[PDB]
């Protein structure tokens, strides 16, 4: 089975400056059985605020043989305002995106990740918020080949690894402290 979750802090999102053991009531070891911690932020904006505000108002405006298909043609344009690749068929191929294709790896594109696990674990023990172990790097290669399954390709490129790296390393560091600004000075060395 797969598990997603909908965690909720005790009040606001920044209930403390201190690490996440001070924030959530969930303790360490059960929390370490997950791979990633998606965290949200919203303080004060205007142009990013309207980008939701002018967006969500238009969603509420979305309230016989030919006419059966003309209603079906009405079903096309109601989800194709900006035409973002409609869900009439996109779910229809996930079912054999999961039961027909199996990926594999290579060996020449590996040892860049060796210092990634070692130094970042080193950088977060002296600054201990919540640790990483042998299983984080197991999740590193796992979500790497998740993307390559959507190329329907069975291989692993070079473009997918650093893609999959730069979705985990930033999403780990961006919940630390006031001293997230110092960690971002290390960040573009990965890129």
């Amino acid at each position: 089975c797969s598990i997603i979750a909908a965690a909720n802090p005790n009040g606001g999102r920044y209930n403390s400056t201190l690490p996440l053991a001070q924030n959530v009531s969930l303790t360490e070891p059960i929390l370490s059985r997950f791979d990633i911690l998606c965290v949200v932020r919203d303080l004060v904006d205007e142009e990013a605020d309207e980008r939701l505000a002018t967006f969500v108002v238009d969603s509420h405006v979305r309230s016989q043989l030919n006419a059966r298909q003309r209603r079906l043609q009405r079903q096309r344009k109601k989800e194709e305002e900006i035409s973002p690749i409609p869900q009439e068929l996109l779910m229809k191929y996930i079912h054999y995106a999961r039961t027909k294709i199996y990926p594999k790896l290579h060996q020449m594109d590996m040892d860049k990740v060796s210092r990634v696990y070692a130094d970042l674990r080193r950088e977060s023990i002296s600054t201990g918020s919540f640790p990483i172990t042998v299983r984080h790097l197991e999740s590193i290669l796992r979500i790497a080949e998740s993307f390559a399954k959507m190329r329907l390709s069975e291989f692993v490129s070079s473009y997918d690894l650093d893609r999959a790296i730069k979705v985990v390393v930033d999403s780990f560091v961006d919940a630390q402290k006031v001293s997230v600004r110092r960690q971002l000075r290390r960040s573009f060395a990965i890129y």
Partner: protein
């Protein structure tokens, strides 16, 4: 008939928004703010929403806190006979079942059977629960789950159940000391946690005072009522012709069509910069969750006056109704 023609005559009146608010309950005097709100709760809003995914909100949910043994308890007496199939429950039995949903033990051929309780039979029904303070610490996420969307879920020792209690609640809690302080906010005097209040709509808390004049007129207001027969008070409607009138009102679907949505967005963009009094100010930041209520009340007031589109003139009473009551929050 002529009673079906009576609606066509009565729909061609002018001040029925002001005629109806004077003709709600003879057991109450004044309080013309909260009389406006309960009438919008008495009708329904809209429920049709976007395609292939989220079903949005279908209603409003309003509470009033106040000192007990006052005029708060009169509306609760009023609605449960006035409304279709609307049940009333104190919500104090927070142990076995009822408010909390919980299956029954194995009896006469099976465990894991569904149970009753005052949410499932409020399917398009307006349930009313009071006394929020005396429940336990577990149900305060359970009804909080029941508030945000219209379904609840259960998996207690049986399979998952997909039941959808289409509800609209009505509440009246108690203050922290029985007397409401004035100089502070109700952030102390809400007596609950934070995010259920932000999940809720706004309140218009009933105030109190002891003046020489209001007690005298309320005394005359109560004795002719407590007469066996002094029916000199005239509501300008009757009960049942009001009851069938809203049954005509529910059969529309007004859509905002004008370009006052550009007028709409600047008001909230001004509004959000007010209740956030700092970057380290409290998490009662009125976010994009309330924008849905900012239009779904705004159509319902135009659904009262039988107009099938939204003008910028109609949302004048929509903006301040939170705002006069959010300045009740914001000192």
């Amino acid at each position: 008939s002529d009673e079906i023609n009576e609606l066509k005559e009565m729909v061609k009146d002018e001040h029925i928004y002001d005629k109806l608010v004077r003709s709600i309950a003879p057991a109450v005097f004044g309080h013309e703010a909260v009389k406006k709100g309960i009438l919008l709760q008495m009708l329904g809003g809209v429920h049709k929403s976007t395609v292939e995914g989220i079903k949005l909100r279908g209603d409003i949910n309003i509470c009033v806190v106040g000192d007990p043994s006052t005029s708060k308890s009169q509306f609760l007496k009023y609605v449960v006979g006035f409304a279709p199939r609307s049940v009333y429950t104190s919500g104090k039995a927070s142990s076995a079942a009822g408010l909390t949903a919980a299956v029954v033990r194995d009896e006469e051929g099976g465990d894991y059977t569904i149970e009753a309780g005052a949410l499932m039979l409020a399917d398009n029904g307006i349930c009313c629960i009071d006394e929020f303070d005396k429940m336990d610490i577990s149900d305060q996420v359970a009804i909080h789950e029941a508030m945000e969307q219209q379904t609840i879920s259960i998996a207690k020792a049986g399979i998952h159940a997909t039941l959808n209690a289409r509800t609209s609640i009505l509440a009246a809690a108690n203050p922290v000391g029985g007397r409401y302080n004035r100089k502070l906010s109700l952030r102390g005097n809400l007596n609950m946690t934070a995010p259920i209040m932000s999940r809720f709509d706004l309140f218009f808390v009933i105030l109190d005072d002891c003046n020489e004049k209001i007690d005298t007129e309320l005394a005359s207001h109560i004795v002719d009522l407590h007469m066996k027969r002094d029916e000199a008070i005239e509501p300008p409607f009757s009960a049942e012709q009001l009851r069938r009138y809203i049954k005509y009102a529910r059969t529309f679907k007004p859509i905002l069509t004008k370009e006052a949505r550009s007028y709409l967005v600047e008001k909230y963009k001004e509004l959000r910069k007010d209740d956030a009094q700092g970057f380290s100010r409290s998490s009662y930041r009125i976010t994009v969750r309330q924008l849905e209520s900012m239009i779904r009340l705004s159509e319902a007031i135009a659904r009262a006056n039988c107009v099938d589109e939204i003008t910028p003139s109609f949302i004048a009473e929509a903006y301040d109704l939170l705002r006069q009551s959010i300045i009740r929050v914001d000192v």
